[PDB]
Symmetry: C3
Subunit: 115 residues, 3 copies
Amino acid sequence: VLSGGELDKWEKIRLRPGGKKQYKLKHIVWASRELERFAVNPGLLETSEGCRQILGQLQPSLQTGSEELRSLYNTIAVLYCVHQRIDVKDTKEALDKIEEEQNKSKKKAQQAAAD
Amino acid sequence: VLSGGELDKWEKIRLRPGGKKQYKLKHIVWASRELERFAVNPGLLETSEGCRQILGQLQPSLQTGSEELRSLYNTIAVLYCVHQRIDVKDTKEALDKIEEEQNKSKKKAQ
Amino acid sequence: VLSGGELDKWEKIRLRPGGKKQYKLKHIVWASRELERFAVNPGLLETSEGCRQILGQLQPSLQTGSEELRSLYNTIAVLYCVHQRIDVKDTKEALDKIEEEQNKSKKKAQQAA
């Protein structure tokens, strides 16, 4: 899933914005076997675009989603930023970074639109 | 999920349209554990809009849907009505009560 | 799910084109157990329409689906064809058939209706 080097980046990211706990290889194994459970292809965790796709399939369920699902989604958000080379200090910065990413492109959509 | 009173109602409602058996405490718990089985939020059973979001989430998987899914759908349907103080005597009523309130949404929406 | 003649047709189909292995009884059973797990009604498997409805539901998940889902969808693709008396030699022919119908009705109920 992660290059050693992505792993090194991963293992410094904190689970919560000021927390002492950090992401670990066990969180990737979990996320992979979780996706397996929900019949999503865990091989997808190995590229940015994979992760982008998974997040899109899970995005809709977020609202009514239990914290086991939100926990899965967020793990994959952090992974995505890691594959993307987007520097984050914790999970929330991951999610913000992804959002302000979408919001930028969806403007360029509106803006490419009137051409 | 339910206050007593709210739960008093619940416990006289019959599984069937017109059969003898009724709604246990045990069915809410089941409904809760089903939801987290489906990674859906169980705290949603605690509110009417909550049950209203769940039913909306579940409503497309229903036709093709298994007996457990349809069973989960129907008790959350009843939960909803009891929650909504829109009372009823069986599931079928609670279900017509959503088919027929949903139509009041559609006829008054556009 | 299948009737004897359907099951002769079935146990004569292969999983891959010039392939050796064909569809056993074990495949109908797995797919039935798989569907109940997916909270889908296994009794749908014994009709062309139900198989149809299961496939249209599964289809959006396919692209990011695991091999378990991909294999669930393929068995059911084949099962439909059989219920339809469509003469598909392997799974590949099964899935283009599913691909043929799924766009017929997609084009229909959007640009006709």
